[PDB]
Design a binder for this molecule. Structure first.
Ligand SMILES: Nc1ccn([C@@H]2O[C@H](COP(=O)(O)OP(=O)(O)OP(=O)(O)O)[C@@H](O)[C@H]2O)c(=O)n1
Ligand SMILES: [Mg+2]
Length: 230
């Protein structure tokens, strides 16, 4: 009976992407970056609603560029990603969400997300007491490079290491309280799983895809444009 809610943190600036316009609004193959994320969730009718969190100062979001897609947008963006997620989780109650419902937090900067991968995550963790994330095992040899230079100090082990992606699937009640705990202890975490972990819970990993990579630096735009439109 647990309903499915989607939460798209979209209140970032994309400072590493070198784009003056927020990278989530950057046009790829004649289409906005965010549009690919929303279209993927829109294809999944089993979702109750998709909430997009944008900054209160966002003057670039144009709803007309996303017409036909089923989603809602709220200007409850925070100073950080975790804050934007926290405000979003609170905001979900407006749409009838409860603490027992699932929430799937997905980066807008990951346009390669597909309905198949969404439903793979859901189907694998729907009966899980905690939930989990989509992720990718570290395939490359890890090198330690001291900050400030390009010199390699030594080789680090990659055994048992995964690179976390999104969506990150957890219960609204457990996730909100976890982040609330993290903020109460002065911790700003990188993803939702981290809060779940520090709260004392054990999240799961589901095999992700390199197609689901996040656009982060100027190379990624043309690369995603190659990955997309295919
Ligand atoms: N204060 C913030 C910061 C990030 N995000 C969202 O979190 C997702 C992934 O975070 P990231 O890749 O780091 O995007 P940015 O923070 O905007 O870029 P940068 O880290 O280079 O500044 C993005 O969809 C971004 O919009 C958000 O909603 N509110
Ligand atoms: Mg960031």
């Amino acid at each position: 009976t647990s309903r499915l809610f989607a939460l798209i943190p979209c209140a970032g600036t994309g400072s590493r992407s070198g784009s003056a316009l927020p990278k989530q609004y950057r046009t790829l193959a004649g289409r906005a970056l965010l549009h690919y994320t929303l279209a993927a969730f829109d294809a999944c009718s089993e979702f109750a609603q998709t909430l997009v969190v944008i900054s209160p100062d966002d003057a670039h979001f144009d709803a007309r560029r996303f017409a036909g897609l089923r989603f809602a947008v709220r200007r409850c963006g925070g100073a950080s990603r975790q804050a934007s997620v926290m405000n979003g989780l609170i905001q979900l109650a407006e749409f009838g969400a409860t603490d027992a419902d699932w929430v799937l937090v997905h980066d807008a900067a990951r346009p390669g997300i597909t309905p198949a991968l969404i439903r793979t995550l859901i189907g694998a963790l729907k009966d899980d007491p905690v939930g989990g994330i989509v992720a990718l095992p570290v395939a490359d040899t890890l090198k330690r490079v001291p900050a400030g230079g390009d010199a390699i100090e030594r080789t680090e082990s990659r055994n048992g290491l995964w690179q976390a992606q999104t969506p990150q699937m957890f219960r609204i009640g457990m996730l909100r309280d976890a982040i609330q705990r993290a903020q109460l202890e002065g911790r700003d975490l990188t993803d939702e799983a981290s809060a779940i972990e520090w709260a004392g819970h054990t999240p799961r990993v589901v095999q992700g895809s390199l197609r689901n990579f996040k656009v982060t630096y100027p190379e990624d735009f043309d690369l995603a444009e190659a990955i997309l439109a295919h």
